[PDB]
Ligand SMILES: O=C(O)c1ccc(NC(=O)[C@H](CC2CCCC2)n2cnc(C(F)(F)F)c2)nc1
Ligand SMILES: OC[C@H]1O[C@H](O)[C@H](O)[C@@H](O)[C@@H]1O
């Protein structure tokens with residue numbers, strides 16, 4: 010029961026008024042883009058690097074060649090909820106072997122020793138499954154966190170992001186932490202030859218297929234980008250010849266107040282309840298670690314206004330992280346019959362009407378569309394800066410992308426591409442989705458590094 014088309018209609022109208030707060034006009038996006046570009050300039054310069062919210066970290070991945078190595082390379086990938094080990098065969102590359110491991114909650118939030126001991130145990134497990142513990146292979150490490158590099162194989166962790174909190178890691182050489190754990194176990198040997206961000210590994214894997222790929226982007230649990238900067242603009246590294254990949258760490262844009270006028274009550278609540286309050290604010294508008302949670306908080310506001318579920322939220326709806334980001338993708342994948350929406354909501358202990366289902370869809374669309382538009386201003390800022398630094402009338406460029414939000418959300422991609430295009434006149438941008446990018450890229454970079 011609960012009919013009346015006129016009253017259902019009035020509830021939808023009040024919902025729209027609340028949802029309108031998520032809207033960003035073209036001018037707001039150009040403003041965000043200009044502010045991002047301003048922060049990127051600040052991050053690159055010696056004079057402002059320490060204060061810059063957007064770190065623009067030199068990765069020591071350079072335009073080459075070189076001296077390419079053939080054969081077997083091991084890739085490690087840490088930075089999601091899962092840890093991946095991959096064996097890559099490079100000839101003249103093919104993902105020959107792969108294993109994913111779930112990281113225990115106690116290892117992400119315990120000590121660095123526990124985390125790296127777990128990683129070492131997973132490497133032993135992989136080597137045994139393929140009978141190769143005795144072979145000492147070159148190892149590429151994709152490590153998806155902000156790192157201050159001294160070289161391709163040496164870098165310090167600046168700070169954990171995305172809920173990681175292992176003590177004794179920040180301020181230490183990450184390659185050293187990995188090497189020390191392998192040594193404490195003592196049942197295999199590996200030569201760690203490179204450590205790269207996941208944006209970087211993604212870019213490298215896509216570049217291998219297409220040489221116009223000089224930008225890497227992640228829109229997964231977190232959100233970040235890297236790009237090939239001119240060495241003359243990389244003031245933190247001596248030399249003006251060629252190019253070097255720069256890990257923007259754009260997720261931290263807004264940490265100095267640059268997004269203040271766009272932050273909503275839901276954003277403040279997500280931030281305050283996160284593992285890193287006041288940090289990674291731009292990432293908190295886009296990343297899959299936060300998207301579902303933003304939707305959950307919007308639904309609770311609509312419940313509070315007596316506009317959804319008869320003003321009654323279930324225990325599950327009032328549970329932190331219960332509205333998963335994958336539910337946002339599934340709700341927006343609904344064909345019109347409301348079946349997928351009904352199922353998600355019924356499993357959350359709710360008894361939704363048809364109107365409740367439509368309202369949940371609009372809340373999802375509002376959060377994910379805003380995520381798409383904010384992300385577009387960041388990518389457009391990077392590409393426009395590249396066009397300018399390369400003094401190109403028309404810049405043709407390829408962007409390699411990975412991450413479950415970009416890949417799996419039914420409309421994020423389309424909304425994001427349309428907005429990027431509007432903000433990048435005189436740019437011809439090709440987007441390529443990476444196939445095992447944050448794994449193959451680390452082995453490929455190791456093949457270039459090993460000799
Ligand atoms: O050890 C070092 O100091 C070191 C190691 C590796 C490196 N550069 C590369 O790997 C480049 C990276 C691309 C990415 C986009 C333009 C250059 N590469 C060039 N070809 C590839 C490949 F994937 F296709 F093989 C990769 N720079 C320094
Ligand atoms: O995984 C995507 C991104 O997540 C977070 O923003 C990390 O700080 C960054 O290093 C990574 O690239």
Ligand code: NA
Pocket residue numbers: 240241242243244245246247248249
């Ligand atoms: Na330089």
